Amino acid sequence: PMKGRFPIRRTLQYLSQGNVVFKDSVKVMTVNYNTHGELGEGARKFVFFNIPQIQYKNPWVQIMMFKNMTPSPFLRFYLDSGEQVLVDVETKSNKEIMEHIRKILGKNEETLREEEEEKKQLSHPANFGPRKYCLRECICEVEGQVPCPSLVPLPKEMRGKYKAALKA
Amino acid sequence: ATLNQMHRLGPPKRPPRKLGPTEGRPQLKGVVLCTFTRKPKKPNSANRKCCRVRLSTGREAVCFIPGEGHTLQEHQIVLVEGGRTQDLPGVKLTVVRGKYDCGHVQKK
Amino acid sequence: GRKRAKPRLEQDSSLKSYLSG
Amino acid sequence: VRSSVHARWIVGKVIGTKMQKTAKVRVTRLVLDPYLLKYFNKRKTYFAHDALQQCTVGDIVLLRALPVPRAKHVKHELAEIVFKVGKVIDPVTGKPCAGTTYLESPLSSE
Amino acid sequence: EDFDTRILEVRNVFTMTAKEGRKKSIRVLVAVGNGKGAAGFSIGKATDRMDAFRKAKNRAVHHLHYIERYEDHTIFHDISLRFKRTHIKMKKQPKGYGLRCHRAIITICRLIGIKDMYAKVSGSINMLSLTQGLFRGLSRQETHQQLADKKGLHVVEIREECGPLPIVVASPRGPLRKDPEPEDEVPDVKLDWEDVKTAQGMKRSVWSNLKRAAT
Amino acid sequence: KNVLKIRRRKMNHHKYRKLVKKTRFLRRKVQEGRLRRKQIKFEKDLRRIWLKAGLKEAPEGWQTPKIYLRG
Amino acid sequence: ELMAWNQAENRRLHELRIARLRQEEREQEQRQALEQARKAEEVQAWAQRKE
RNA sequence: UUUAUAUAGAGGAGACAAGUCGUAACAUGGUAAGUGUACUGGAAAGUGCACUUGGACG
RNA sequence: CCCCACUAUGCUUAGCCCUAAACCUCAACAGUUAAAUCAACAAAACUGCUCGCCAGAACACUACGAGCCACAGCUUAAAACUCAAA
RNA sequence: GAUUAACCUUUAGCAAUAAACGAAAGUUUAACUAAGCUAUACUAACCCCAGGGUUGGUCAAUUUCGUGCCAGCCACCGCGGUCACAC
RNA sequence: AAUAGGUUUGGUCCUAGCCUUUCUAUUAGCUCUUAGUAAGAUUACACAUGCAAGCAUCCCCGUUCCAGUGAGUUCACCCUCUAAAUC
Ligand code: FES
Ligand SMILES: [Mg+2]
Ligand SMILES: [Mg+2]
Ligand SMILES: [Mg+2]
């Protein structure tokens, strides 16, 4: 089987489930937490579960952990403007922490939908090109148009080999 | 191996595939320096027709001549291909019958 | 001496007969 | 605000103070292993300008990208010492702390 | 008359006896099944192949398992078991998927009456170990009714072809629990690397999903 | 268990010791030549270092020691 | 607005932490009273034995 | 000027007619076997010291 | 092989060499005895975590390179030819 | 030409598109277009017009002779010393 | 790497390699009817010959493009800044 406790954490299907996508302001997130303590348990599980997903959804945000540096776990986001956002996470479960950070710094679903629409706007359906970029490679695919000569040979009149004969 | 060890060593590396007697080529032009016979390793008993030839790469190697009967002599141009002769140790080349000076197997 | 075929390599035609009829 | 340096803000660990007015900081970023899909720390060395020489080897600092590289490798300035080594001030409560225990209790000042 | 017999392997075991030295004998593994969930297997040793066949099938007909089948065409849940040195990973599959399994597993499943299933065999491919491990895994599987009775909850089936309609396949015969089952955000299960790689698409294989004859 | 692998290792070691005994003088001469080449190459590397550095000669008071000699 | 809300949440959590710390400090005062009650007798017995 | 740098005496590995020679190993394998190391011997090996049971036993 | 005599050596001092069937042939730490106890044998079966190591046999406790007070040495350690096994 | 196991014609036209130039009609282009050669591949057809490999097992499929550990065969296991489903 | 298969032994179990079966490409043998399309020196080795860049009232502009090759090789991507170029 897959090595490690909770191997589901190491699947793209799980890493892509992070609902938290930070605004462009966030640059650094420091996770201070304690390896032992009943109050910090949720924070610990947060570091066990949500730090991957978040880091997957925000590849350009530097996430740095710190074990047993302060008596209470907390997050400290750094924004581009220089603001520092301190989020106490003691007594909060990992799901509550994710909800809180999504509320205060994550993009709203409307912004994500707008960005997805912007991305989909690039691939115009009417374009023709390789399957990597366009839905169709040639107009011959569209029915009604003259088909590709590799499949249906063209009439002798439409082929230059005999247009040249007509020229003669 | 632990996950950290796997990450450190990285994905396993495919060993460099060894080039055969033909040096990774389907065929090689050769010049027959001499011809002789080789005794196959036991328990097979025979007199296998073979010929030392100088390949186009400059290397000289022993090649097996299949079929019955041959006009191959010295200085005759042949084309050799891969495929070891099972009962002959060290013979890893076979002469392509019907190519260059190697005439087809004289029937009967 | 002479060749002695391996006991495990000896052919069996019972299956051929069964499939034949 | 505009700067040619890529990493605008980085939180790192000072691992050197030998250079004059320049702290050598180590910044670790999580990187996804494409084969294991596990996140591993990848560490990069940065040089931060420290005018006051207040960096101690081992403290956690915040580095802000300079508008231009003042030297060949010095591209960042020490914005703030997030955690002084052995002198951590608990941001949640403001009281000093030594590891996971309070040197001064939050109840002390009431 | 309802039962069909199929040979899984025939082996010429040679035994060294004091007087005769090497003596030939036939060991035959057969499986018998009626196609309606009742099947078994047996070994037969003899001097003649036909005697081995007769012994093996007449003994297998006395050792019948009963393999519970979901909708009479597939297994109830995904199974992964190791018998000795043979790993069998069977996957429940929808109707029309056919039998994509080791040929011995295909034969045994036809005898049982399973039409749709996937199965990968790893480790030693010892035919007897594979066969009896397969029978063990199929016999030990838990039906939806058994699951509902155990946990006292409705077993609700969600089908993509049927949209969001909840289909109840099994309801507990006793009292129904009022407290919802705890919904852990991260389940604690042991996944298979092969399954994960296949799902992610990184499982490049020039031998997987090859077009094959109807099963 | 049997000791076939151990026996093969023992035979290999016996053959190797026999070969060393047979040709120990030639091996000693070859090793001495190899040590000479080693020292020469080391000195050439140091010379290359200070030549690329721009110094016309070795630094004052520097002599490359014979680090590859028993004496 | 989100920053102000986060600061308000931090203040609320700080008040809860202060209450919890007060309760824990009272409990630790009781525990220290018990420990000193044991330790005074232990040290007195040890000193008397040594004397 | 030695080394680098382009072939060529000589060694080593495998195979070949293969058996000859010794009978070391496998049985308490004919003197239990083996690891390390040392000396002797052209070699087959022999012995010293410690260790192992992957030997046996009143 | 046995007997006798005798030396290096076993001993002390000070250095060196750094090997073993250095083997409980069982890595360290933590946990479990419930499932399926389990290829076999050895020594009941496993789980979590970490480090080290292995990827057919032989070539090879080898060659070369490097390091070492080691100079018939030790550590690290290949490849070519060959086999369909080991 | 040489070399390698590796082997396209010493064609045509600027009519299309593209480029250069010009205010422009236009001009030029071995880019390109339209042809030539080649079972390298794909598609389509055959009405007369099919060959290549294999047939011991893996692995679909051998009758009769000849040969006699020879001649020969095999991808792996292997076959052949007289009656070879393996030449 | 599979739905796997053959192969170690007197035999079984396990470990393990090798090979088979699938799909492409090049070359070779033998064979080959037509039509349409696509693709097409082994070689950064040497080249006979012909052509491949002109335009245009002179100046200018263009011949720095297109085409070709894969010898060399982390100059290709993102950001900052900012030339040339076009409007
Ligand atoms: S690909 Fe569209 S006409 Fe051929
Ligand atoms: Mg040897
Ligand atoms: Mg010991
Ligand atoms: Mg350890």
For residues E99 and E116, the answer to whether their CB atoms sit within 8 Å is: yes
Distance (Å, rounded) from C-alpha E193 to C-alpha B6? 14
- E190 — contact with chain A (CB < 8 Å)? yes
Count Cβ neighbours within 10 Å for each residue of B74-107 and write b for 16 or more, e otherwise: eebebbbbbeebebbeebbbbbbeebeebeeeee
- Could D106 and G25 be called an inter-chain contact, meaning their C-beta atoms sit closer than 8 Å? no
**Which residue's CA is the nearest one to ligand 1's atom 2?**
A138
Domain ranges of chain F: 1-70
Distance (Å, rounded) from C-alpha F44 to C-alpha F30? 21
Per the structure, the count of domains in chain D is 1
In the beta sheet, which residues pair with residue D80?
D62
Distance (Å, rounded) from C-alpha A54 to C-alpha A48? 12
DSSP state of B14: P
Could you identify the residue written with the tokens 């499943």? E109
Distance (Å, rounded) from C-alpha B14 to C-alpha B24? 17
User: What is the distance in angstroms measured between the alpha-carbon CA of E86 and the sugar C1' of I38?
Assistant: 13
Q: Phi and psi of E159, rounded to 5°?
A: -115, 130
Q: Where are the alpha helices (DSSP H) in F1-71?
A: 4-22, 24-52
| Token reading at A133 | 């970029």
Report how many helices (DSSP H) and strands (DSSP E) chain D contains, helices first.
Answer: 0, 7
In the beta sheet, which residues pair with residue D77?
D49, D64
For residues E33 and E112, the answer to whether their CB atoms sit within 8 Å is: yes
Listed in sequence order, the residues at least 6 apart from D105 whose beta carbon sits closer than 8 Å to its beta carbon are D95, G21, G25
C-alpha closest to that of E95 among E12, E159, E22: E159
**Which residue's CA is the nearest one to ligand 1's atom 4?**
A148
Distance (Å, rounded) from C-alpha G36 to C-alpha E22? 88
Backbone angle region of B30, left / alpha / beta, with phi > 0 → left and psi within -120 to 50 → alpha: beta
- Could G2 and A104 be called an inter-chain contact, meaning their C-beta atoms sit closer than 8 Å? yes
Domain interval for residue D14: 1-109
State in Å, rounded, how far the first CA of chain E is from the last one: 23
**Which residue's CA is the nearest one to ligand 1's atom 1?**
A138
- G9 — contact with chain A (CB < 8 Å)? yes
Angle at D10 between CA D26 and CA A110, to 5 degrees: 140
Distance (Å, rounded) from C-alpha D22 to C-alpha D47? 6
Say what angle helices A94-104 and G2-50 make with each other, to 10 degrees.
140
Distance (Å, rounded) from C-alpha G48 to C-alpha G39? 14
| Token reading at F52 | 């690329």
* Dihedral sign computed on CA atoms, order E188, E189, E193, E195: negative
Angle at A161 between CA A155 and CA A167, to 5 degrees: 105
Distance (Å, rounded) from C-alpha A73 to C-alpha A40? 6
Backbone angle region of E163, left / alpha / beta, with phi > 0 → left and psi within -120 to 50 → alpha: left
Q: What is the resolution of this structure in A?
A: 3.0
- Ligand 1 atom with minimal separation from the A150 CA: 4
Q: In whole angstroms, what separates CA A85 from the centre of its chain?
A: 24
Listed in sequence order, the residues at least 6 apart from B99 whose beta carbon sits closer than 8 Å to its beta carbon are B78, B79
In the beta sheet, which residues pair with residue E4?
E33
Q: Which nucleotides of J are covered by protein (CB under 7 A)?
A: 3-6, 33-36, 42-43, 56, 69-81, 85-86
Amino acid at site A105: L
Residues with CB under 6 A from ligand 1: A 137-138, 140, 148, 150
Distance (Å, rounded) from C-alpha B92 to C-alpha B63? 7
Residues from chain B that touch A3, judged by Cβ atoms under 8 A, are: 2-3
Report how many helices (DSSP H) and strands (DSSP E) chain A contains, helices first.
Answer: 5, 4
Our mutation pick for probing the ligand 1 site, out of A131, A135, A136, A140, counting the most ligand atoms within 8 A of Cβ, is A140
C-alpha closest to that of B6 among D34, F44, E107: D34
Coil, strand or helix at D30 = strand
Nearest ligand (C-alpha, residue F11)? 2
User: What is the distance in angstroms measured between the alpha-carbon CA of B13 and the sugar C1' of I40?
Assistant: 34
Listed in sequence order, the residues at least 6 apart from A59 whose beta carbon sits closer than 8 Å to its beta carbon are none
Count of residues for chain B? 108
For residues F45 and F68, the answer to whether their CB atoms sit within 8 Å is: no
Distance (Å, rounded) from C-alpha D64 to C-alpha D27? 13
Distance (Å, rounded) from C-alpha A2 to C-alpha E193? 5
Listed in sequence order, the residues at least 6 apart from E20 whose beta carbon sits closer than 8 Å to its beta carbon are none
